[PDB]
Design an enzyme around this catalytic site. Structure first.
Site, PDB file in Angstrom:
ATOM      1  N   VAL A  19     115.898  16.891  75.812  1.00 29.81           N
ATOM      2  CA  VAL A  19     114.989  16.277  74.851  1.00 29.81           C
ATOM      3  C   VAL A  19     113.657  17.021  74.831  1.00 29.81           C
ATOM      4  O   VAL A  19     113.052  17.254  75.879  1.00 29.81           O
ATOM      5  CB  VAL A  19     114.726  14.807  75.203  1.00 29.81           C
ATOM      6  CG1 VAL A  19     113.834  14.172  74.152  1.00 29.81           C
ATOM      7  CG2 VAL A  19     116.035  14.069  75.329  1.00 29.81           C
ATOM      8  N   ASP A 129     122.613  -2.190  78.347  1.00 28.14           N
ATOM      9  CA  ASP A 129     121.971  -1.265  79.285  1.00 28.14           C
ATOM     10  C   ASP A 129     120.457  -1.297  79.139  1.00 28.14           C
ATOM     11  O   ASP A 129     119.773  -0.283  79.321  1.00 28.14           O
ATOM     12  CB  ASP A 129     122.524   0.153  79.084  1.00 28.14           C
ATOM     13  CG  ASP A 129     122.231   1.095  80.269  1.00 28.14           C
ATOM     14  OD1 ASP A 129     122.101   0.633  81.416  1.00 28.14           O
ATOM     15  OD2 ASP A 129     122.160   2.306  80.047  1.00 28.14           O
TER      16      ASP A 129
HETATM   17  C1  LIG Z   1     112.281  11.728  79.346  1.00 28.68           C
HETATM   18  C2  LIG Z   1     113.057  11.263  78.203  1.00 28.68           C
HETATM   19  C3  LIG Z   1     114.434  10.900  78.416  1.00 28.68           C
HETATM   20  C4  LIG Z   1     115.270  10.424  77.344  1.00 28.68           C
HETATM   21  C5  LIG Z   1     114.670  10.341  76.037  1.00 28.68           C
HETATM   22  C6  LIG Z   1     113.294  10.700  75.806  1.00 28.68           C
HETATM   23  N1  LIG Z   1     112.929  10.548  74.502  1.00 28.68           N
HETATM   24  C7  LIG Z   1     111.758  10.076  73.973  1.00 28.68           C
HETATM   25  N2  LIG Z   1     110.605  10.247  74.643  1.00 28.68           N
HETATM   26  C8  LIG Z   1     109.508   9.757  74.055  1.00 28.68           C
HETATM   27  N3  LIG Z   1     108.315   9.912  74.705  1.00 28.68           N
HETATM   28  C9  LIG Z   1     108.198   9.938  76.082  1.00 28.68           C
HETATM   29  C10 LIG Z   1     107.619  11.147  76.635  1.00 28.68           C
HETATM   30  C11 LIG Z   1     107.477  11.220  78.074  1.00 28.68           C
HETATM   31  C12 LIG Z   1     107.923  10.080  78.872  1.00 28.68           C
HETATM   32  C13 LIG Z   1     107.766  10.119  80.388  1.00 28.68           C
HETATM   33  C14 LIG Z   1     106.397  10.670  80.735  1.00 28.68           C
HETATM   34  O1  LIG Z   1     105.440   9.888  80.775  1.00 28.68           O
HETATM   35  O2  LIG Z   1     106.294  11.882  80.947  1.00 28.68           O
HETATM   36  C15 LIG Z   1     108.505   8.868  78.327  1.00 28.68           C
HETATM   37  C16 LIG Z   1     108.646   8.789  76.895  1.00 28.68           C
HETATM   38  N4  LIG Z   1     109.514   9.128  72.858  1.00 28.68           N
HETATM   39  C17 LIG Z   1     110.641   8.944  72.172  1.00 28.68           C
HETATM   40  C18 LIG Z   1     111.822   9.436  72.740  1.00 28.68           C
HETATM   41  C19 LIG Z   1     113.091   9.299  72.087  1.00 28.68           C
HETATM   42  N5  LIG Z   1     113.044   8.849  70.829  1.00 28.68           N
HETATM   43  O3  LIG Z   1     114.135   9.651  72.617  1.00 28.68           O
HETATM   44  C20 LIG Z   1     112.442  11.180  76.880  1.00 28.68           C
END
Ligand SMILES: Cc1cccc(Nc2nc(Nc3ccc(CC(=O)O)cc3)ncc2C(N)=O)c1
EC number: 2.7.11.24
Length: 329
Positions: A19, A129
């Protein structure tokens, strides 16, 4: 290699397919992209076909949508698939392990979770989940449920199974009935998760951190205490009931004890959501109408679904067809 055409540029790793975060030159904003290519492993395609179908059908503020999908123009050339979604600032998991949520924050998060669950369930679908890492949050704290990988269509009629039946969903948020006689085909299975999630927002740590199958169960009976005679009677499976009976007596730990700093109303709702007997577990609508969420509860502003929702050749072909609307013409 993140080949997402020209429209999306300025890539950068985000998490783990892979991602990344790309800039949408067409929307003058940034978004997130997920690279998927599990086609080789059949045991990883149906999960991609399910979510895509369920996510395109669903349309809810508290549920992540698919703004666009990328793939080759022909089934022959189609290798990797790129699903595009709104880029959030973080998730409940990262937030819980670093921040302290105020009562107002917990209330709002609980409301948004249940509001979207109500829609999911109204479409006869089970998430199965739900957990912090599956709840995305923006800068203003608006919440969105994501990942319908293990979602299924409700099937109460055929939910019973033998004792000790393998289950996929995350252990820590699995309902006690799953390790006893439930296959997880009932809506009450989602309420239990939302429950565990509530407790976690209160003490910043999972309530039932089981180390393994049974550890999860013995960790639950630790707080709730041994299940009453009635609850056991409900259980018909001899193997399952005899195990609960073989277990030593365990007293109930009072909620006001585990979270003395919590709000009484919230705890009263936490009690309804974490009920051993699934049949008596509170419903989502009954949760939204709970006094705790009284300042947010508004049935007219809580939409429901309009209608109730394979060899190594059909899944690829099916996924290929389900992603056509995002192709020109
Ligand atoms: C790490 C991770 C694993 C699986 C999916 C995402 N995907 C996504 N990630 C974010 N922001 C997002 C960016 C970083 C984190 C963790 C951190 O604080 O570093 C959590 C969410 N927003 C939307 C999606 C999405 N629509 O899939 C991110």
């Amino acid at each position: 290699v993140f080949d997402v055409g020209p429209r999306y540029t300025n890539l950068s790793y985000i998490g783990e397919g892979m991602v990344c975060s790309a800039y949408d030159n067409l929307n003058k904003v940034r978004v997130a992209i997920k690279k998927i290519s599990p086609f080789e492993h059949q045991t990883y395609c149906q999960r991609t076909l399910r979510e895509i179908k369920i996510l395109l059908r669903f349309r809810h503020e508290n549920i992540i949508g698919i703004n666009d999908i990328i793939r080759a123009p022909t089934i022959e050339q189609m290798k990797d698939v790129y699903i595009v979604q709104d880029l959030m600032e973080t998730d409940l998991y990262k937030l819980l392990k670093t921040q302290h949520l105020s009562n107002d924050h917990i209330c709002y998060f609980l409301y948004q979770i249940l509001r979207g669950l109500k829609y999911i369930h109204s479409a006869n679908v089970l998430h199965r989940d739900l957990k912090p890492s599956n709840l995305l949050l923006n800068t203003t704290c608006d919440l969105k449920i994501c990942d319908f990988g293990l979602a299924r269509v409700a099937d109460p009629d055929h939910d019973h199974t033998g004792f000790l039946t393998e289950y996929v969903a995350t252990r820590w948020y699995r309902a006690p009935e799953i390790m006893l006689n439930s296959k997880g085909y009932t809506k009450s299975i989602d309420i239990w998760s939302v429950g565990c999630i509530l407790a976690e927002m209160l003490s910043n740590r999972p309530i039932f951190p089981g180390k393994h199958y049974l550890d999860q169960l013995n960790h639950i009976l630790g707080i709730l205490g041994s299940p009453s005679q009635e609850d056991l009677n409900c259980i018909i499976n001899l193997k399952a009931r005899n195990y609960l009976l073989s277990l030593p007596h365990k007293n109930k730990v009072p909620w006001n004890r585990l979270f003395p700093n919590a709000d009484s109303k919230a705890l009263d709702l936490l009690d309804k959501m974490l009920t051993f007997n699934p049949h008596k577990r509170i419903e989502v609508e009954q949760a939204l109408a709970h006094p705790y969420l009284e300042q947010y509860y508004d049935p007219s502003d809580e939409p429901i679904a309009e209608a109730p929702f394979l060899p190594k050749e059909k899944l690829k072909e099916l996924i290929f067809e389900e992603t056509a609307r995002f192709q020109p013409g």
